Amino acid sequence: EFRPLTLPPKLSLSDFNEFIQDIIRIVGSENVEVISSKIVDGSYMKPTHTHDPHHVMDQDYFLASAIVAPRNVADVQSIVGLANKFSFPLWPISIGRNSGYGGAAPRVSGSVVLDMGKNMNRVLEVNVEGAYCVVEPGVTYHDLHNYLEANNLRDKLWLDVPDLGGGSVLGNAVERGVGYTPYGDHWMMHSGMEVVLANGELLRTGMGALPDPKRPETMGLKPEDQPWSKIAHLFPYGFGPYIDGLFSQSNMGIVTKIGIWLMPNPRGYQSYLITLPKDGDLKQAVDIIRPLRLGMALQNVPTIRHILLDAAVLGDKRSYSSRTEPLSDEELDKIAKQLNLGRWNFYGALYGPEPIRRVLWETIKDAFSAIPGVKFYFPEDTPENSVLRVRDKTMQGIPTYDELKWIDWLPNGAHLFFSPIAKVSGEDAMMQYAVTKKRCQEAGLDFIGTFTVGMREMHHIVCIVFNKKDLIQKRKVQWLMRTLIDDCAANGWGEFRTHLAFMDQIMETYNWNNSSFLRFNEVLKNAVDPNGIIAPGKSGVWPSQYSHVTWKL
Amino acid sequence: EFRPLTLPPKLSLSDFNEFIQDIIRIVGSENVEVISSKDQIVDGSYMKPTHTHDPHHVMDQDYFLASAIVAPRNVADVQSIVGLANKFSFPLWPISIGRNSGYGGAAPRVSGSVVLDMGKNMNRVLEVNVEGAYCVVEPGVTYHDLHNYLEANNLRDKLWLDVPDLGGGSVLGNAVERGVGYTPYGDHWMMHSGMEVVLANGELLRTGMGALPDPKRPETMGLKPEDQPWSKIAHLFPYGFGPYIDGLFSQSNMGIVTKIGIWLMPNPRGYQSYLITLPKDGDLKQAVDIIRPLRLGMALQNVPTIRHILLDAAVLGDKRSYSSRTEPLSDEELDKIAKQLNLGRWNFYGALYGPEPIRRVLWETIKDAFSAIPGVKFYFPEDTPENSVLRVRDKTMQGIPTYDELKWIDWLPNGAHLFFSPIAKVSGEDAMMQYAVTKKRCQEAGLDFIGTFTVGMREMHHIVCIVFNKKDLIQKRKVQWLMRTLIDDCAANGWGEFRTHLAFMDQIMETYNWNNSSFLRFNEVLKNAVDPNGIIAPGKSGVWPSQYSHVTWKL
Amino acid sequence: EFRPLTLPPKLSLSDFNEFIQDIIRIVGSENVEVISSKDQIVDGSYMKPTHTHDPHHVMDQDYFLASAIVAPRNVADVQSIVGLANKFSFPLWPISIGRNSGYGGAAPRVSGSVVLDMGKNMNRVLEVNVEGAYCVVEPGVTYHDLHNYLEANNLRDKLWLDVPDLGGGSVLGNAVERGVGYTPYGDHWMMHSGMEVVLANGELLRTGMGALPDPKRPETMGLKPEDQPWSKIAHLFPYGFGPYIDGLFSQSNMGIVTKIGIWLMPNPRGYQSYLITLPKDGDLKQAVDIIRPLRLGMALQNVPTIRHILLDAAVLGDKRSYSSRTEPLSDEELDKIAKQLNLGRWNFYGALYGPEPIRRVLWETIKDAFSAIPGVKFYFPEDTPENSVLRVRDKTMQGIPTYDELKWIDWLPNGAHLFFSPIAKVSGEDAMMQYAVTKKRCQEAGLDFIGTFTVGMREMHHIVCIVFNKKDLIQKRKVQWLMRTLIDDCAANGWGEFRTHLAFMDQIMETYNWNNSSFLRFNEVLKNAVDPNGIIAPGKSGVWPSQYSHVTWKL
Numbered sequence A: 001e002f003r004p005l006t007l008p009p010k011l012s013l014s015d016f017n018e019f020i021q022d023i024i025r026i027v028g029s030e031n032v033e034v035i036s037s038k039i040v041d042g043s044y045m046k047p048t049h050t051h052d053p054h055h056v057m058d059q060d061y062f063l064a065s066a067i068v069a070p071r072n073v074a075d076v077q078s079i080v081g082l083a084n085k086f087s088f089p090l091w092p093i094s095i096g097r098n099s100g101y102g103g104a105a106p107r108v109s110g111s112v113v114l115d116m117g118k119n120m121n122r123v124l125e126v127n128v129e130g131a132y133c134v135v136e137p138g139v140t141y142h143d144l145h146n147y148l149e150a151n152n153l154r155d156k157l158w159l160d161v162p163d164l165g166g167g168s169v170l171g172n173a174v175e176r177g178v179g180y181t182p183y184g185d186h187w188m189m190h191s192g193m194e195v196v197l198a199n200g201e202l203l204r205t206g207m208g209a210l211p212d213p214k215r216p217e218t219m220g221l222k223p224e225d226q227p228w229s230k231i232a233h234l235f236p237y238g239f240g241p242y243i244d245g246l247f248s249q250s251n252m253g254i255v256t257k258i259g260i261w262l263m264p265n266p267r268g269y270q271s272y273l274i275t276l277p278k279d280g281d282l283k284q285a286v287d288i289i290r291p292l293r294l295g296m297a298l299q300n301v302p303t304i305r306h307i308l309l310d311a312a313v314l315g316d317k318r319s320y321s322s323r324t325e326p327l328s329d330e331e332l333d334k335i336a337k338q339l340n341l342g343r344w345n346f347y348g349a350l351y352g353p354e355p356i357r358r359v360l361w362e363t364i365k366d367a368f369s370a371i372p373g374v375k376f377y378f379p380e381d382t383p384e385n386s387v388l389r390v391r392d393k394t395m396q397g398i399p400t401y402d403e404l405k406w407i408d409w410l411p412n413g414a415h416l417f418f419s420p421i422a423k424v425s426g427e428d429a430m431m432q433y434a435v436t437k438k439r440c441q442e443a444g445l446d447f448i449g450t451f452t453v454g455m456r457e458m459h460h461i462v463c464i465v466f467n468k469k470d471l472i473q474k475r476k477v478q479w480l481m482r483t484l485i486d487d488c489a490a491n492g493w494g495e496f497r498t499h500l501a502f503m504d505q506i507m508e509t510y511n512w513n514n515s516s517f518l519r520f521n522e523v524l525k526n527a528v529d530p531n532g533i534i535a536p537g538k539s540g541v542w543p544s545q546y547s548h549v550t551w552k553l
Numbered sequence B, C: 001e002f003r004p005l006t007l008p009p010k011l012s013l014s015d016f017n018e019f020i021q022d023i024i025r026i027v028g029s030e031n032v033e034v035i036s037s038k039d040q041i042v043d044g045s046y047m048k049p050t051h052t053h054d055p056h057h058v059m060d061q062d063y064f065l066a067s068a069i070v071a072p073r074n075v076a077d078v079q080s081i082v083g084l085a086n087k088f089s090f091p092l093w094p095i096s097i098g099r100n101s102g103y104g105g106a107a108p109r110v111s112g113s114v115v116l117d118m119g120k121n122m123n124r125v126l127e128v129n130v131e132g133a134y135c136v137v138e139p140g141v142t143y144h145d146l147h148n149y150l151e152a153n154n155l156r157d158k159l160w161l162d163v164p165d166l167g168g169g170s171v172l173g174n175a176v177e178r179g180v181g182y183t184p185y186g187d188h189w190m191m192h193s194g195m196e197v198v199l200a201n202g203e204l205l206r207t208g209m210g211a212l213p214d215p216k217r218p219e220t221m222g223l224k225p226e227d228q229p230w231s232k233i234a235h236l237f238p239y240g241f242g243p244y245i246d247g248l249f250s251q252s253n254m255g256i257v258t259k260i261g262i263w264l265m266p267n268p269r270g271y272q273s274y275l276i277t278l279p280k281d282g283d284l285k286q287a288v289d290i291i292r293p294l295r296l297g298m299a300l301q302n303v304p305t306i307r308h309i310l311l312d313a314a315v316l317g318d319k320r321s322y323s324s325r326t327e328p329l330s331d332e333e334l335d336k337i338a339k340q341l342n343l344g345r346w347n348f349y350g351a352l353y354g355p356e357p358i359r360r361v362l363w364e365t366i367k368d369a370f371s372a373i374p375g376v377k378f379y380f381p382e383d384t385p386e387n388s389v390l391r392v393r394d395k396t397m398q399g400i401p402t403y404d405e406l407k408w409i410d411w412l413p414n415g416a417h418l419f420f421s422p423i424a425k426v427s428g429e430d431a432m433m434q435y436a437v438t439k440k441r442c443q444e445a446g447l448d449f450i451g452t453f454t455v456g457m458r459e460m461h462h463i464v465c466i467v468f469n470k471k472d473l474i475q476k477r478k479v480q481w482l483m484r485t486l487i488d489d490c491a492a493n494g495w496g497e498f499r500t501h502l503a504f505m506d507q508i509m510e511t512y513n514w515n516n517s518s519f520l521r522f523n524e525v526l527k528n529a530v531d532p533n534g535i536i537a538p539g540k541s542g543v544w545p546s547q548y549s550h551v552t553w554k555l
């Protein structure tokens, strides 16, 4: 509780010590860790909460003065009123496995990272008839999966998981994360949420604003402990202004609870793989997809994975090639052959009773048969190490950590995400792939990515892997991402999600009518948090105390 | 114009004229009607909606009243009018079409406001994109309009609509209200992406991927913001980057909406409407229970509906065609009406979509499922008389605008509807309790219960169709009592209301008072941030800006 | 007057009339024209400049539009008008003569502003001092005016002017814009000392040694500030003591300039104009390289110029006199035009000044220097046909106003110019790259490249002469695209623009965004300090005072 590496802006060593003393008294020093020593990157099992584990900037560039971990909601309210008093900026995390996007690191160096999930980790409710659950920030996907297994529940309810099962359900959902079942759109499938505002008051959204009737057993409970109205997590909208969205990808409050819809057991499942021989086959693949996914033949969020993405799960670059320079079109085709895979590979799944799956499979099979050399497999038709057998788990909400392995492609693996949005049009996908690829090869990187598919849009997750001891390769990775953002905005593709180092540049792409969108958000931001306390800079939304000349990247 | 019926608060007749002078000089005289006489406050009809007051008046006819009507030509005029309203601190009340009958019509909350008719002159279908399966509309594009525009382009073989019970509504307007359709695309609000707004400060704003600008190119140069094209992804993906602000402008007074992107369902390549009659009054409980898993599993694809017998019977006749009885029809009489029309006491309407192998399976499932109920009969449109409700809902559940549902408003003489719209769990017990509360209060007030459960995913909108004689000033007072009581009864049992009439907005938002009205105090902070002068629709959804006395204006 | 075409922001028609009433009562009716009809927005000519809108309109003709024209008699009226504009918060847009065609003409940035015609009635040459070699002028003193005044006093044997390409411009006006002449005294702004200004607060101010007051004496008593004489050193030495503030009032909206002191070159005692033809398109690279050291060494005394063949050819004829071709002339055709007129593809115009022993040496140097190029031919005015451009520039490079250059605006039917004016290093490679960017975009838009490098000391102003048919609404949109693209291309290669049209002011200042628009945020702080009410020319050079929404008004 004395001397930290960095402090937040305009702030005296007296004040920090005075602040963190009061905190160390509120939550006990078990739950306080001041950052005093010259900050290790940590693992997925025990993630760092100090700085960016997959640093593309300098390692120390995003740096927490401390880490606080409240026991409950009250302590959050207390910490905030203290933050307000000292004009001490916060940075909420749920779990802090948001690697690829900066992890648990704050934008403003000197901030407290508020580890919400360390203690607040209860699966508050799983509800079978409403087909929902209510979770705190500390509930991971494996955790929630576990809860279902210990109560014999996957007979009745399945999850939706991102590629790894370690993320926060709460946390992923407010970043508008994505999965790969029919409930892949995580933000969409929320209903009812609790929030500590910058002023310390508790606000519950949607039908959660309708209080549960007064009665003997719940009488005298604190707000944070009060139960929800019956409809709270069944109907997202409530009455009047639908505000829920003000707390997604924002710095408008601290989220303490949330309802998530769970898809009930289909009563029949079957994943599949479709390999696409040629690199050119993508255009035609996306054109066939468009009306299949619009039609609800492709019921889940399906995904077109580049060859190197599959290859990188199975081994590192070394295990394929000894070369420094990026792999050629010829060498990729060999790997395709070495694995019994296409230059692109379409993973997907069927849901519901046998006769329905029969009709959609028939059509998907003949639909795709339009492409020369196409082939079809189920899990059983593939090698026991094959990716399909992993994604077979993913696409029914069984968590896996197998997908982590492609980070190791290069030694000292870090990922960085460039994630623009395209039309579900072969022409658009290809013109975007070609922009991405051009810049990757200029930057000396192997192109790795997916095109994942929503209803009418395609998230093109580009998977930038780099050696983080290699200071040259970072410098040009930084160039790659800054160039690709400016490029894709020059063909009308925006990014839906990013890393801390780019939130300013990306928000500047969204500058229709002289940055009208951002100007409106600032007004909202400064309205609800006068003292600029909560996560300044998040999504490039700066409160009025942060001058845009010192602080915009 | 010189001498209006009411003025808005804190404002002199000299100022109204200076204000309307400067406005007739912007929009033109054609586009301004000033309500200067009791000739102008006439209820009119659905085909010609009054734009001055509540046509379906539960309060005094003239309680909610406009000083004047102003039909902006285009978005610039709105920017201009907002700027002027700010200068004169003149409250505005935006509408798109103004058929929000049952929830106040076109009337403003604050008497003396300008009803800003957004759809008189902003009524173009700006875009229909087939490969994206979406359209872009300005405020005045009705359902029948958008529908016609599809027929005029031989597009229905590719794209279908989603319609509410009546085809005259604004696509734009209903969406922001979160109205309810009856195909898969029924949640009209969900099915939006990218929308344009004039703020209280006059600035133009586009949400989602609208904020990403369509790249410069020669043919788009020198265009006024409102007339610029959109990005590739504006209407393909609603979130964009950063805070998702779209919800701030649904059921709110934070902006004036100029354009919206709406998704359209593609033509399913096969369709089959159907009706399942549920014999006894009590068959509702078992029915909901059967409906729950099939909706959750997506065996029920559309937004199906469970229609109380009087709803269907009111479509086919007014009350005096059935009883010539003053009091509300007995249980014993409700059955004879049902036997007379070959209907159940509850009636379940629904549609199957897709290729016929798939539809057949889903029908096998639904039919076997419902067969658990004693007496159940199934029908396709084909199997019922021409006048039947199913042939209307056959059209409704594949996006075709109709107007047949109007008839039920004439249940009583001088008939007007009012909707009390509480939400419920998809649970027989919960559905039945709510119904029991509702029905008991309807008897207590001397009204025939009429209503419908529209089944969302995890959730039912129980629409309660209050039909009253609007010349009967004793019935109004009972209706008001009925509404104010039911809000409290249903709040006392944990059911919220998703949508209301102007007169009940403040009471309804008073039920959302978890943690000492925390949700309202937050919306108030936001409102005052973005509309310092309280120009836009003060009192919409209980949200009063700081100039309005909560003591004086709440109800 | 009662009903103008546009009004300024946030302002009622009642206020405009109260404001113009009080003004007709100050200046007089003769000095106020109110733009109340579409008869008044006529482009007119160079000899009679419209003072209401952009005569050379790339936007809609009426995008930039005045509410009214006001011709103050004298400095008091300005103090009065400023005071009143402040009271009514009425934006003003000062002009001296209003021939800023190619950069917006006399139009204001904010539609509805008062164009304040400073040179109608303040047009005296206040002083010509021979021993100091300087003059003092009010706003309305054109070049031809000042020139005539020298002939009327048999002064040319002692003092010469410096003129831009056209003699109708304001000496005052061009200087504050930093226009460019073509003798040694070409940097018109450099060549100023001591200037008088009315501030936004009404107070009168004199810069440099103007702030040192001319000592009291009997014949100067009781004079109104504006009519007081100046100090000995006011116009001999520009700095004075303390902060040098003169730059705050060039290309800015910080003041209204009432008087300026300008230095005049003495008669050199010998002069010789000349033209050097550079045969091939590519001879530009070698040429610049030769020009660099000779300019730096002062072997090239004046501001010489490198004129693209079409510039000279456009002076001699419109496009239909050469091709009757829609598309832009090919490289192969540009050569035949050059052979037809005994000219190079580039053409270098220049002058030698001083006593003949000195001129001869400098010509020996220049001639030998340029001889490095294959094909080079030299000429004196004498050696060319009467119609030639050199006889015009012979007059231009010794201060004589002409109007022959006007012809090139008629290259196309309904022709209007627009200047894109990026800066470059005096380096062949850099000159050539910039030219390659510019030319490529001109082809991409379907325009003939026409342009000129005017060589400063270390620096070249590459003036790009965009001629377009102003009735062709497809070409305007291409021109706009051309301009907005080129700003970005040239910013992407480190070239800034020194001067622009109203429509491109905000984009251009957006390139000056080093350190998160630090230079603009500073100028904004200053602006708001000195003009709290945002009265003076809001939006000049991208500088918006705090009342204007940057969201709404930027382009």
Ligand SMILES: *Cc1cc2c(cc1C)nc1c(=O)[nH]c(=O)nc-1n2C[C@H](O)[C@H](O)[C@H](O)COP(=O)(O)OP(=O)(O)OC[C@H]1O[C@@H](n2cnc3c(N)ncnc32)[C@H](O)[C@@H]1O
Residues within 6 Å of the ligand: A092, A093, A094, A095, A096, A097, A098, A099, A100, A103, A104, A116, A137, A162, A163, A164, A166, A167, A168, A169, A170, A171, A172, A174, A175, A176, A177, A178, A179, A253, A254, A255, A256, A403, A404, A407, A415, A535, A538
């Ligand atoms: C490395 C990697 C990452 C990854 C992935 C595959 C690999 C190999 N696949 C992903 C996928 O398929 N889908 C997806 O959405 N993300 C994927 N990622 C990224 C990441 O693993 C996941 O998104 C992960 O679930 C996110 O991490 P976590 O859940 O730990 O999130 P967080 O750091 O706690 O939160 C991120 C930010 O959100 C704001 N935040 C979080 N909690 C709160 C609360 N309670 N209140 C207010 N704001 C909150 C903060 O801005 C925080 O930094």
Ligand SMILES: *Cc1cc2c(cc1C)nc1c(=O)[nH]c(=O)nc-1n2C[C@H](O)[C@H](O)[C@H](O)COP(=O)(O)OP(=O)(O)OC[C@H]1O[C@@H](n2cnc3c(N)ncnc32)[C@H](O)[C@@H]1O
Residues within 6 Å of the ligand: B094, B095, B096, B097, B098, B099, B100, B101, B102, B105, B106, B118, B139, B164, B165, B166, B168, B169, B170, B171, B172, B173, B174, B176, B177, B178, B179, B180, B181, B255, B256, B257, B258, B405, B406, B409, B417, B540
């Ligand atoms: C009488 C009746 C009504 C009815 C119905 C059946 C009958 C017999 N069935 C309905 C149904 O199945 N589903 C449904 O959603 N509504 C149903 N109704 C009610 C009504 O007919 C419809 O909701 C109708 O579409 C709404 O009317 P309209 O489309 O005319 O909308 P509005 O009255 O113009 O707008 C209502 C409110 O919306 C806000 N608003 C509208 N436009 C704007 C803009 N541009 N900017 C800002 N706000 C806007 C205002 O709050 C306005 O008061």
Ligand SMILES: *Cc1cc2c(cc1C)nc1c(=O)[nH]c(=O)nc-1n2C[C@H](O)[C@H](O)[C@H](O)COP(=O)(O)OP(=O)(O)OC[C@H]1O[C@@H](n2cnc3c(N)ncnc32)[C@H](O)[C@@H]1O
Residues within 6 Å of the ligand: C094, C095, C096, C097, C098, C099, C100, C101, C102, C105, C106, C118, C139, C164, C165, C166, C168, C169, C170, C171, C172, C173, C174, C176, C177, C178, C179, C180, C181, C255, C256, C257, C258, C405, C406, C409, C417, C540
């Ligand atoms: C069409 C054309 C234009 C042209 C040219 C050749 C042709 C064919 N060659 C030029 C050249 O060689 N050098 C040059 O500098 N300019 C050339 N031009 C452009 C134009 O003709 C001249 O620049 C001309 O002298 C400018 O017109 P004018 O002298 O009329 O100036 P203005 O329009 O009245 O003023 C322009 C702006 O200046 C500010 N201003 C002017 N007076 C005041 C006062 N008193 N106070 C405050 N500000 C003032 C305003 O910003 C005004 O908008």
